[PDB]
Structures are given as structure tokens and as C-alpha cells.
């Protein structure tokens, strides 16, 4: 009973230890995933900016086209 008890305690100690190691690994993977996520956000962000400039250009061009069609009618 006693021997099994001490061994049980040391067992729980080891289990908790390796558990914490697993935690370290998991928060590392989380860390990296987060980093690359942010990178993707920057890239896609700049892409969205280019999209906006595209929309503005379209608007101005179609404004001019509207002008020409009103000058033709």
C-alpha cells in the first residue's frame, strides 16, 4: 500500500512533467501558426489595397465614359 503510494506520487509527478512539455510544444505550434497568420494578413491586406485602387480607377474611368456618352447624346 505504501510503496504503491510513493510510486503513485512519483508517477503523477512524471505525468504532470511530460504534460507541461506537451504544453510547451503546443504553444510553440500555436506561436508559429499565429506568425504565419499575421504574414498572410499583411499580404492579403496589400492585395485589398490594390483592389481598392482598382475600384477607384474604374470609378473615374466610368465617370469619364459617362461624360462622353452625355456629350454624344
Amino acid at each position: 500500500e505504501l510503496e504503491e503510494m510513493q510510486r503513485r506520487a512519483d508517477q503523477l509527478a512524471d505525468e504532470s512533467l511530460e504534460s507541461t512539455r506537451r504544453m510547451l510544444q503546443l504553444v510553440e505550434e500555436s506561436k508559429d501558426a499565429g506568425i504565419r497568420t499575421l504574414v498572410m494578413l499583411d499580404e492579403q491586406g496589400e492585395q485589398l489595397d490594390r483592389v481598392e485602387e482598382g475600384m477607384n480607377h474604374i470609378n473615374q474611368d466610368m465617370k469619364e465614359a459617362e461624360k462622353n456618352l452625355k456629350d454624344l447624346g
Binding site: 505504501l2 506520487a9 512519483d10
Partner: protein, 140 residues
């Protein structure tokens, strides 16, 4: 008849040390003038009388509350064959400090795993023959 003693016992497996807590005592007989004695408890490992631990002296109370703690740096393997001794002493400034009571706890009867804490009745300390030798012969 002297009174009872509430104490705590448990083992810390993380540091491999015995945690013995002296909570309090009750209904102690009075041996001093005022109608109350000056009690203090001496605690030590029963197997070897080395590094005995003594509590602080409480003045004139038949229900002293010590709430103190002692640590015995002893491995868990050696612990099983080791006993605990808690003896209640009466302090006197001008004479020998008379023993009020004593209590012995076998560590094979103790169950660790849950924090133990109990009241146990005090008994009178033993004063046997000193020689303990024997001679054998034949008569015809």
C-alpha cells in the same frame, strides 16, 4: 486522566520529509500553584532519540494551543519502521520539568495519502529492570 492531545500527521513525497504538526491539548491536570500548569510538548522520532523538537512554553493554561509544525527529513523507506513520540511536559523554573504525559505512534499503523489529524488520550510515561542479564546453571 491528564487530558487529550490533538495532533496532525502527514508525509510530503515531494521533499521526502515527515510533517508533524502539534495542534493543541485539552483537560490537562494541574500541577502548579495558580490552579493551572505551564505546559510544553517535546516531539521526536521514536526510533532514534536525535534532534528532539520542543514547542514554546505556554504560561498557566490547562488547554494550551501550540499550532506549531516540525519537519523530520526522513526517507519514505526508513519511515515504516520508525515511531513518533509526543510527550507533554510541565515547566518549572526552579526544579526538574516533570513529564505530564506521553504518546507513541507506530508508522506502520499510520496511513499516508490523506492528511491525518486526530485526538489521542495521554498516558503516564514508563519509569523495567536495568540489568537484563541471565545466568544458566545446573543443580544436582
Amino acid at each position: 486522566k491528564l487530558g487529550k492531545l490533538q495532533y496532525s500527521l502527514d508525509y510530503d513525497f515531494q521533499n521526502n520529509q515527515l510533517l508533524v504538526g502539534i495542534i493543541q491539548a485539552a483537560e490537562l491536570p494541574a500541577l502548579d500553584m495558580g490552579g493551572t500548569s505551564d505546559p510544553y510538548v517535546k516531539v521526536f522520532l521514536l526510533p532514534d532519540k536525535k534532534k528532539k523538537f520542543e514547542t514554546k512554553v505556554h504560561r498557566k493554561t490547562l488547554n494550551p494551543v501550540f499550532n506549531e509544525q516540525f519537519t523530520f527529513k526522513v526517507p519514505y523507506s526508513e519511515l515504516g519502521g520508525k515511531t513518533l513520540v509526543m510527550a507533554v511536559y510541565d515547566f518549572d523554573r526552579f526544579s526538574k520539568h516533570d513529564i505530564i504525559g506521553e504518546f507513541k505512534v507506530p508508522m506502520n499503523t499510520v496511513d499516508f495519502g490523506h492528511v491525518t489529524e486526530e485526538w489521542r488520550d495521554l498516558q503516564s510515561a514508563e519509569k523495567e529492570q536495568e540489568k537484563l542479564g541471565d545466568i544458566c546453571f545446573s543443580l544436582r
